[PDB]
Amino acid sequence: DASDYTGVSFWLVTAALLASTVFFFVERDRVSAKWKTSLTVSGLVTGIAFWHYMYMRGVWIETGDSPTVFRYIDWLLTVPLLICEFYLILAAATNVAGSLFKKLLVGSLVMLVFGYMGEAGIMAAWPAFIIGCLAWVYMIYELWAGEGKSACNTASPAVQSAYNTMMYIIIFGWAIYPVGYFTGYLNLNLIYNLADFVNKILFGLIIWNVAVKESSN
Amino acid sequence: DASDYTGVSFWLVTAALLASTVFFFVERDRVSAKWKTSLTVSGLVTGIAFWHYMYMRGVWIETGDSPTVFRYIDWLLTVPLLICEFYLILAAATNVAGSLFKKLLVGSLVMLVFGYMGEAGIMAAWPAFIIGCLAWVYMIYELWAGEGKSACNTASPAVQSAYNTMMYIIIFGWAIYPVGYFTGYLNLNLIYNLADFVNKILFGLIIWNVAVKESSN
Amino acid sequence: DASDYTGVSFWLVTAALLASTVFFFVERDRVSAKWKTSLTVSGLVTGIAFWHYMYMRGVWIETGDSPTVFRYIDWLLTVPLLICEFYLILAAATNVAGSLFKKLLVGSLVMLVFGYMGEAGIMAAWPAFIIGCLAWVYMIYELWAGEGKSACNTASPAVQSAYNTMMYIIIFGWAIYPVGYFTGYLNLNLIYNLADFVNKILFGLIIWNVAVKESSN
Amino acid sequence: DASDYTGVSFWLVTAALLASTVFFFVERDRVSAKWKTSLTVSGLVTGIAFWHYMYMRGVWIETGDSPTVFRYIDWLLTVPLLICEFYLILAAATNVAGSLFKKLLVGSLVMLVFGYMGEAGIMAAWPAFIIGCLAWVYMIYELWAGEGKSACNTASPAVQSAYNTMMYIIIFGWAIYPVGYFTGYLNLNLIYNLADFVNKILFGLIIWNVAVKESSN
Amino acid sequence: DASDYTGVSFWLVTAALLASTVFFFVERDRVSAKWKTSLTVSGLVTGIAFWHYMYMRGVWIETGDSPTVFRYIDWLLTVPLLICEFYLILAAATNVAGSLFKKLLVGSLVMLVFGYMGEAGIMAAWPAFIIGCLAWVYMIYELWAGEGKSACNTASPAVQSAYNTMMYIIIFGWAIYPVGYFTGYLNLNLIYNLADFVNKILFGLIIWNVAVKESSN
Ligand SMILES: *C/C=C(C)/C=C/C=C(C)/C=C/C1=C(C)CCCC1(C)C
Ligand SMILES: *C/C=C(C)/C=C/C=C(C)/C=C/C1=C(C)CCCC1(C)C
Ligand SMILES: *C/C=C(C)/C=C/C=C(C)/C=C/C1=C(C)CCCC1(C)C
Ligand SMILES: *C/C=C(C)/C=C/C=C(C)/C=C/C1=C(C)CCCC1(C)C
Ligand SMILES: *C/C=C(C)/C=C/C=C(C)/C=C/C1=C(C)CCCC1(C)C
């Protein structure tokens, strides 16, 4: 109807994710070869999201409920790529070793695994939340004062601005999901749909903007 | 049948939108890198429209009625991109700051939100219509004598002609929708389908024409 | 079965239209930027046809009958593009004003509208047929001795040969449809399906041939 | 099950045809503009096959039986393109008139039409088989010592090797289908599925190999 | 549910394979013409997998059980391409005859055929396993000290590193499947799904990495 505001959000975010996927896959012509992968991922991320969003919608239509499990699946598939985007832009703008890529991947996977263990009752909720937040804070530290920051200090000002915007997205927009787990273990689907709009579309648009700016200039 | 003239329009506009989407995504080869995004959007707009048009048709088949709500959804997704097209062509033809982009986006979002609030009964119909028309007139003023006009005054004559045609489209073709809300709060689906044909296909064709002309010349 | 020869034709023409759509959209790599649009349209035409052909097949399977109305819909969408192809090849080979484009579009639309009015009983059959044939003959005259002929006289011999072949297609292959209306207002689906094979696939292949020849040479 | 070996073949050939279609449409980047069409066709052929293969599978699932009629439809669509491939490679490697294209098209169409007339009982089986085999042998002669051979004698050794391999495919792999008609008018679906694997995938791979070799060298 | 861990894996691997297919087909822009085919295959492999994975999921939903037979079908289609990847990278980096390609293809086909004969009871399980493992070991030897190793010794260090990583993947990740047949003839679906994740996605990513590195450098 006009009062649930959940199915509607579902449709809005689904169409926006489809459009973002097509946009990121099409706008690789405006960027150099070094930024193509970055854009490819931005597109894959949004495409995976859409795919899973579709299934969340089918399950919601059949028996309305939370797709948390599926939302751990998509997350399992998309959060690693979103955290790799930092390594991709650093590799396209300067010299980065790849140990940053490995440690970011490990941190994101550990965070998601412990979050799911807390969600399904396999592990105690408070320790699982603590370990997930520790992995999240470790990723934040690696992007703030670690290998990522050291590699970013040797990049152009446009790349540095994009890196700062992406880091602030990781700090604040990603903070919604741990706030949800906290609240749920102590509406949600609508908040998660909107969260994605920024986390997946605005993130990719920041990457696309810096890539197009660098390739033109 | 042959007398409703509504489902038929639905099929006509749906096929035209599909064709326009493919055309805009394919004809990016004829334009320079500066115009590619403009064409990408023209394609995304028409594509989103088609997508939502499909759902409007399924809902009409199941239980015939107005898709207003969905038509606020697609609009919510397409009107910002259509109003961004001005910024995109100005950026591809001359130097434009981006404050124009921000203010156009804010104005379009405010207009659509107040229109929906008037449509759903959340807010009083007359104040909602007044605020929506004020946002529309503010966008018209920004394109007529504001930052958009100032940026257009430093462009080539072909870009100026395209900008004037797009502005007149915004003034007149977009005027149909507030006329509908007025009439409905004081046939409609057919008028809205035809409205789109011009607002979404002719708009994109004007953009495509100016982009191809500039890229060849 | 093996005796209707109608559903079979439907499948043959549907697959041929799909293959032609893919061929035209793919073979734009072999042509210069000036001919890309021409090929894009040839592809869109065939694609729209396929789309509508699909629906004609669904309706025929559900309740076998004539899709005339839908066949006025697709025609409404494809005949303008087919007649525009003349303007597109003239623009890609020489200087043509565009008044030719406008007058061809108006003539084709008037012809189709009056044909539908005669088909649905809105207007008297004989006057509607007379007006439609007058619009058709006016288009033929414009292509034979008018602005189209004047623009074609200043083109390369290959473009002139393609223009003559397309004009003879317009004269003879398009003559089937008025012969059908005459016969029906004084088998048909099979004749219309075959008609399309030449009108839509051979037309586009003539355009593709001249475009590839000019781009290579 | 695991003993029919027909539905399984169907799945194997369907997936292989899909993969070949994608491969041929994608690998046009490795070839020059002169070979693009050749690859386009190789792709269209496999794509049409897949399309029709799908329907053959739906009909087999609904009421298991021979899709001969449909197999005359696809053949009607694909055999002309496969026999045109000779003209396409000769045109991309040397000067060929096009009378070869016309006579190959006529011969293939006559062969298929008489084969279907013999299959449906419209014409006597033995005369229809004789006329079809005469058309097939005429095509073989035109490729062996006719205009095709004359054009091939003025080509590079790689093109000559590809032409010889394609001609031997026409002689031997195509010989399965007349052997089937003979046997059936005096298992089969499995033999026809495998036949296609070579006739449609190996043929296109020979064309792709020679095109890539010539374009690189 | 949340305890089967099989259907979930199915969804995870299906989405990952789709994403990998799109990634490998899209990232051909970053590589030279010599590596395009390599990437094309990496994409086709993953694509075919996805396709078959879909059907495995439909069969599992309808009547839950092992898709071994279908898993011999996809394997029949994908293992040859995966083993051809060695020849493709060797051809894109140095001079390789093609006898390596032929012998690898024959070995993979023999291995799969004997494995299926052991699985279906056509041939005795122990002799079929012995012959399949002999073919596998022959392929390993050809890649370790045969024509493949001889061709790899004359390649750049990056290509040699990629070749070594792919060879170790063949040695260890491919060892899961014979270990399954052993265990089943003396959980499995989950192990096979994960096996694929590495065998099909990591293999293609190694190829993509070396191709992009060589093309940029
Ligand atoms: C597109 C989806 C995104 C970006 C999801 C991000 C999710 C997280 C950052 C989740 C984090 C969690 C913790 C930090 C600890 C508690 C459990 C989680 C999984 C909710
Ligand atoms: C493709 C759809 C388009 C371009 C839709 C445009 C819609 C508008 C300009 C709607 C405007 C309205 C007002 C100005 C005030 C009253 C309420 C609205 C939302 C109908
Ligand atoms: C792909 C479809 C094509 C090219 C259709 C062409 C249709 C016409 C040229 C129809 C012409 C008619 C008249 C000239 C007068 C009588 C009514 C019509 C609409 C049948
Ligand atoms: C992909 C399908 C192909 C290449 C089919 C080829 C079919 C033929 C060469 C059929 C030939 C026949 C004759 C030569 C005479 C008897 C009847 C036919 C149609 C079976
Ligand atoms: C994507 C699928 C892949 C890479 C599958 C690989 C499968 C094998 C290497 C199977 C090997 C077998 C033997 C070596 C002997 C016993 C039977 C088989 C077929 C299980």
Numbering used by the authors:
A (entry chain A), B (entry chain B), C (entry chain C), D (entry chain D), E (entry chain E): 25 to 210, 219 to 249
Give the exact sentences the study uses for this entry:
Microbial ion-pumping rhodopsins (MRs) are extensively studied retinal-binding membrane proteins. The green-light absorbing proteorhodopsin (GPR) was originally discovered in marine γ-proteobacteria as the first bacterial rhodopsin and as an example of a new type of bacterial phototrophy. The bacterial green-light absorbing proton pump proteorhodopsin (GPR) has emerged as a model protein for MRs and is used here to address these open questions using cryo-electron microscopy (cryo-EM) and molecular dynamics (MD) simulations. GPR possesses an N-terminal signal sequence, akin to numerous membrane proteins, that is hypothesised to guide the correct insertion of the protein into the plasma membrane before subsequent proteolytic removal.
To this end, we expressed the GPR-A18L variant, introducing an alanine to leucine substitution (A18L) known to prevent cleavage of the signal peptide in the blue-light absorbing proteorhodopsin (BPR) when expressed in E. coli. Subsequent analysis of GPR-A18L oligomers by single particle cryo-EM revealed pentameric and hexameric particles. No corresponding densities were found in the pentameric GPR map. No density for the N-terminal signal peptides could be found, presumably due to significant flexibility and a lack of interactions. Conversely, if the signal peptides have moved away from the centre, the protomers can come into closer contact and form pentamers. In both the GPR-A18L pentamer and hexamer, the same two interaction areas are observed, comprising a large hydrophobic patch running along the membrane-embedded region and a polar interaction network towards the intracellular end. While most interactions involve the same residues, the hexameric GPR interface is slightly larger due to the closer proximity of the protomers and the narrower angle of encounter. This results in a larger surface area of 950 Å2 compared to 790 Å2 in the pentamer, excluding interfaces involving the signal peptide. Despite this increased contact area, nanoDSF analysis of isolated GPR-A18L pentamers and hexamers indicates greater stability of the pentamer. Using a GPR mutant with an uncleavable signal peptide, we solved the cryo-EM structures of pentameric and hexameric GPR, revealing that the signal peptide is involved in the formation of the GPR hexamer but not the pentamer.
